[PDB]
């Protein structure tokens, strides 16, 4: 979970290479999208949509080995100064769009790094973030300009626990080279379903056994399939913290340029009239 | 008295005016024939803003990135000058490509204008070199790794490859020497080179006139 | 519109026309009609578009260089996408270098190859136009391919 | 990265024809 | 939508400026 990300990697969810830490436990790759404005004004509330799409009709494997629908999660790394908008500043429509999302910072003094999830995947394939842009006018550390936005989006159960132990949502290879003779069942500790396989090793319920009655397998071959139907995907985006004065003066300058062009053309027309009258060109 | 007559008697301005007003533009010259000029415009922009940024940019591994941030955040209209530099660089290359499209699709490279075309190709290589050298001056991840991933390419060349690579990066690895050489290339060598070849280009064009109608 | 017909009674002009020159002796007056009045329109237009782009979409300042951390994405500027693609597609590095060098050299060879005829109009240059369109399409193919995974280079995510 | 790209391409393509049309119109109302 | 109107009328405005300046300076015996 994202709080496992902030548990294992407290400083930041982003490695120096730009790789999001969720990829250390979520080994499958699925497409993640983002929707942010090209530019925003200071002290403005805007929408940032993280899209984590998957096939709802395709279910995953739960911890006990049975089917379950999957949940979605995400980490949104905003530029410095940006943070989740105060509810007093959020319009009613946006409130309607957000839903029951629990926005959390990655840590203190890290309000621009928001983590979200797990959320019911069937109702939250698009997660809406209410973001408040900062204001350079009252913060010397904030400047107008183009900044990066780093998004990580995730579906389904992970493959590795924070303790370092594998989950049942995995493909199970082998242990050695020989002949399969251990296709049974049964248990001991808790409930659920376990499988004992030697040639010793044990594989949990969930992954479908692709090996049946007596197979001559080698070390490295696949004992089961890959039950994973989820995945993690990260993406970069850009946002411009824009100053209204810059744009205003830009518009003025453009207008002046266009006027100047008009005057130049008209002047040429006058000269054409003269050259038509006279005859020295 | 009259100052104009003073400057005329010495500079012979009248001859210049006559020469300028003796030239004409043939009907087949359409809007695409502006592209070359537009390319030049972009370069002039690059020359101006570029010069400006030399008053604040610092070609050191310790200072480069910080100097760029300083230009963007603290320098009056620094963000503007730099952003203009970026966009006008990209536009210079684009307009140059479109210009080549014009020249080729009007057959303007054929006899006797071959040397103008060759001069042109050289100009293209020089311009791309501007791009490559400038791209890495901020010494951010993108630029630095843009250098690292391409600095080892000439090593493929059998006998002189390693030497070429060493000359380009100022050593056997990418570091401060690489930045120094890239900065010299970018603000000294390439401006003068492109000046010389643009001069040849324009002199040859003015000498021969534009190519004929299609 | 101001226009001046070519004086075909002037042997100097005829001599230039025979050599493919002299095409600045006739037509619309360069000065001031084009140079003084139209050129500033182009200059100011170019400058205004560039400035507008600069203001609305300012230059980005990334993160400081890290020699021990290779970014997930590494690309040069767009105009180097084709070459780059070549460079990362060919297993032989030397062959890649030669191919890269072949671009400006081949371009340099173009006039000496197409001097076989004096045609300028592409519609009178079927073979040359075909080769050009082909090369352009290939160049775009490589350029688009550069921004995609290597496994999908000869396909661009199509067939 | 396909939406903004295709949009930019389409615009930079068609605005040319819009400007061409405007210039032509100005020429016609001029009486050239 | 806003971008469309803003684009069209501006454009429409400056074309009005160009034509108005044309016939204006014409009527003012300048052009």
């Amino acid at each position: 979970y994202p709080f496992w990300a902030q548990q294992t990697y407290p400083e930041t969810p982003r490695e120096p290479t730009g790789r999001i830490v969720c990829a250390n436990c979520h080994l499958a790759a699925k497409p993640t999208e983002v929707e942010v404005p090209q530019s925003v004004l200071p002290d403005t509330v805007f929408k940032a949509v993280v899209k984590i799409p998957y096939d709802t009709s395709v279910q995953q494997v739960g911890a006990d080995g049975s089917k379950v629908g999957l949940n979605v999660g995400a980490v949104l790394m905003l530029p410095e100064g940006f943070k989740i908008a105060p509810e007093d500043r959020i319009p009613e429509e946006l409130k309607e769009e957000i839903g029951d999302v629990y926005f959390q910072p990655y840590g203190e003094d890290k309000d621009n790094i928001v983590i979200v999830g797990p959320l019911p995947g069937e109702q939250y394939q698009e997660i809406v973030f209410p973001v408040l842009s900062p204001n350079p006018a009252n913060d010397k550390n904030i400047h107008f300009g183009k900044y990066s936005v780093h998004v990580g989006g995730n579906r389904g159960r992970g493959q590795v626990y924070p303790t370092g132990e594998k989950s049942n949502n995995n493909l199970y290879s082998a242990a050695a080279t020989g002949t399969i003779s251990k296709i049974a069942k049964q248990e001991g500790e808790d409930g659920s379903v376990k499988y004992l396989v030697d040639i010793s090793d044990t594989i949990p319920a969930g992954p479908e056994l692709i090996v049946s009655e007596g197979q001559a397998v080698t070390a490295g071959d696949a004992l089961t399939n890959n039950p994973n139907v989820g995945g993690f995907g990260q993406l970069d985006a850009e946002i411009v913290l824009q100053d209204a004065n810059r744009v205003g003066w830009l518009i003025a300058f453009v207008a002046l340029v266009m006027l100047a062009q008009v005057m130049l053309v008209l002047k040429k027309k006058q000269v054409e009239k003269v050259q038509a009258a006279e005859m020295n060109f | 008295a009259n100052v104009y007559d003073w400057f005329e008697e010495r500079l012979e301005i009248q001859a210049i005016a006559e020469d300028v007003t003796s030239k004409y533009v043939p009907p087949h010259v359409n809007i695409f024939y502006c592209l070359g000029g537009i390319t030049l415009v972009c370069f002039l922009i690059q020359f101006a803003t570029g010069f400006a940024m030399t008053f604040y940019y610092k070609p050191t591994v310790a200072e480069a990135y910080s100097s760029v941030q300083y230009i963007m955040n603290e320098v009056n209209f620094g963000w503007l000058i730099r952003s203009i530099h970026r966009w006008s660089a990209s536009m210079m290359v684009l307009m140059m490509i479109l210009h080549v499209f014009r020249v080729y699709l009007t057959g303007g490279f054929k006899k006797p204008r071959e040397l103008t075309w060759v001069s042109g190709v050289i100009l293209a290589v020089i311009t791309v070199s501007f791009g490559v050298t400038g791209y890495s001056l901020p010494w951010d991840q993108v630029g630095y790794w843009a250098v690292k991933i391409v600095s080892g390419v000439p090593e493929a060349i059998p006998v002189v490859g390693v030497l070429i690579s060493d000359l380009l990066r100022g050593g056997s690895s990418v570091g401060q020497a690489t930045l120094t050489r890239y900065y010299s290339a970018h603000t000294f060598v390439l401006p003068w080179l492109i000046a010389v070849f643009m001069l040849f280009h324009f002199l040859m064009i003015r000498k021969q006139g534009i190519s004929g109608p299609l | 519109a101001t226009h001046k017909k070519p004086d075909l009674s002037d042997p100097t002009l005829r001599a230039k026309l025979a050599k493919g020159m002299g095409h600045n002796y006739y037509g619309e007056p360069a000065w001031p009609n084009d140079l003084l009045y139209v050129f500033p329109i182009v200059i100011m237009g170019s400058f205004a578009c560039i400035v507008a782009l600069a203001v609305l979409d300012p230059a980005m300042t990334g993160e400081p260089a890290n020699p021990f951390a290779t970014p997930l994405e590494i690309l040069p500027e767009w105009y180097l996408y084709p070459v780059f693609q070549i460079l990362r597609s060919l297993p032989n590095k030397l062959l890649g270098v030669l191919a890269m060098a072949s671009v400006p050299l081949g371009l340099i060879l173009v006039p000496f190859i197409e001097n076989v005829n004096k045609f300028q109009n592409p519609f009178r240059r079927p073979v040359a136009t075909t080769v050009f369109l082909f090369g352009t399409l290939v160049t775009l193919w490589l350029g688009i391919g550069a921004a995609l995974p290597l496994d999908k280079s000869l396909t661009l995510g199509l067939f | 990265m396909s939406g903004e790209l295709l949009n930019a391409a389409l615009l930079s393509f068609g605005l040319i024809f819009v400007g061409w049309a405007l210039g032509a119109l100005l020429l016609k109302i001029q009486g050239a | 939508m806003l971008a469309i109107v803003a684009y069209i009328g501006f454009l429409a405005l400056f074309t009005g400026i160009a034509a108005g300046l044309l016939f204006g300076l014409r009527s003012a015996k300048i052009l």
């Binding site: - | - | 519109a1 | 400007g19 061409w20 | -």
Partner: peptide
């Protein structure tokens, strides 16, 4: 946030208008 839209619009318009004025001044291209 309309000022942003008007900014981009100003870019598009100055592009279009530059083309238009070159076409007008050079009498159609």
């Amino acid at each position: 946030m309309a000022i942003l839209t008007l900014g981009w619009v100003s870019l598009l318009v100055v592009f279009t208008w530059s083309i238009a004025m070159v076409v007008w001044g050079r009498n159609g291209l």
